[PDB]
Amino acid sequence: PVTLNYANFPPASTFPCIQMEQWAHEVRTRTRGKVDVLTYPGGTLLGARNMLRGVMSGQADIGCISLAYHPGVFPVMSVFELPLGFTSAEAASSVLWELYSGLRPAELERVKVLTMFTSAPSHFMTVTPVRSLRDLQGMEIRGAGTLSAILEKLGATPVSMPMPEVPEAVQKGIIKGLFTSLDVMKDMNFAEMTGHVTRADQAVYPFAVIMNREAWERLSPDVQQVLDGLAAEHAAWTGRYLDAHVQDSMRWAEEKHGVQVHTLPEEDIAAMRRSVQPLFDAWAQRAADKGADPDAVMRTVDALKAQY
Numbered sequence: 001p002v003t004l005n006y007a008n009f010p011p012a013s014t015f016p017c018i019q020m021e022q023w024a025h026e027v028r029t030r031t032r033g034k035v036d037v038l039t040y041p042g043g044t045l046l047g048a049r050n051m052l053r054g055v056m057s058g059q060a061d062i063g064c065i066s067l068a069y070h071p072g073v074f075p076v077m078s079v080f081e082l083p084l085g086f087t088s089a090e091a092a093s094s095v096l097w098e099l100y101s102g103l104r105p106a107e108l109e110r111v112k113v114l115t116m117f118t119s120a121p122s123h124f125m126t127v128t129p130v131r132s133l134r135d136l137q138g139m140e141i142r143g144a145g146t147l148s149a150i151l152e153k154l155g156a157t158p159v160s161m162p163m164p165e166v167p168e169a170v171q172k173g174i175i176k177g178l179f180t181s182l183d184v185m186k187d188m189n190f191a192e193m194t195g196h197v198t199r200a201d202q203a204v205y206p207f208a209v210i211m212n213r214e215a216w217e218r219l220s221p222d223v224q225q226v227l228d229g230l231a232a233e234h235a236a237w238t239g240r241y242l243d244a245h246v247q248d249s250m251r252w253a254e255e256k257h258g259v260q261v262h263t264l265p266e267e268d269i270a271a272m273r274r275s276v277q278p279l280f281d282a283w284a285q286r287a288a289d290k291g292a293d294p295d296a297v298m299r300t301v302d303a304l305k306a307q308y
């Protein structure tokens with residue numbers, strides 16, 4: 001009987017926390033009680049910025065990081081912060097895990113990765129309506145990592161910060177909106193702060209569930225096969241729950257808070273995609289400078305997408 005503390009950073013109602021709870025439930029079940037998990041949601045054990053170095057301290061056995069909160073640190077897996085044309089968190093979460101399983105980039109060698117998943121595709125949630133690219137101009141919008149560099153290519157003024165700091169940045173007028181997936185309209189009640197939603201069909205935010213290496217090595221081989229055996233299912237499950245939850249979330253926001261939804265013209269969309277193309281090369285260049293094979297990574301992205 002061994003018990004693992006699992007640090008998380010956002011409120012318990014948000015999807016990073018819902019997936020942690022479902023994960024914990026499967027570990028208890030599949031190990032027939034041999035493993036238990038005590039979860040600390042809402043940043044009570046570790047928060048968003050001390051998540052990684054704190055899992056590695058051993059201050060918590062397991063944690064959940066958003067790759068985009070750590071610029072430079074993940075030269076390979078940050079490809080998953082580019083617009084890879086995904087339209088569901090299910091598909092993207094699955095392809096992300098396979099791409100990680102099959103390559104094991106050294107950026108992530110100092111911890112043990114238990115599973116990976118993403119957000120749904122990003123859209124604009126703003127306090128004033130955005131009906132064109134022109135409206136985006138100069139408007140401070142929250143992103144992180146490469147989703148900020150995307151905001152920037154589109155002409156908005158990106159402000160990088162983790163999700164928990166976002167409600168307060170909006171309220172105090174430091175940002176005018178946020179660029180991410182629509183589950184937060186409910187799970188963080190952005191429906192009471194940003195009454196407008198514009199379709200972007202943009203890049204996802206990728207997450208990794210990590211574990212302290214020494215903690216992982218103190219697990220027997222049998223318990224280890226249980227956690228490795230849970231990884232791919234759980235990635236898909238997390239992606240599938242979120243695609244459903246995004247619908248409910250937006251249903252609630254419209255009929256209980258009168259959210260207004262807008263779309264951009266096709267010529268604005270065309271042009272925004274042309275605007276972000278240079279990020280693929282800059283991503284390819286930082287990976288190479290770090291000793292990675294971006295050509296290989298993109299070849300593996302392509303091939304995985306033609307399955308999932």
Ligand SMILES: O=C(O)Cc1c[nH]c2ccccc12
Pocket residue numbers: 010014015016066119144162163179180181183184205
């Ligand atoms: O925007 C992000 O930081 C990624 C993201 C999307 N939905 C979230 C819910 C809780 C915490 C992080 C996220």
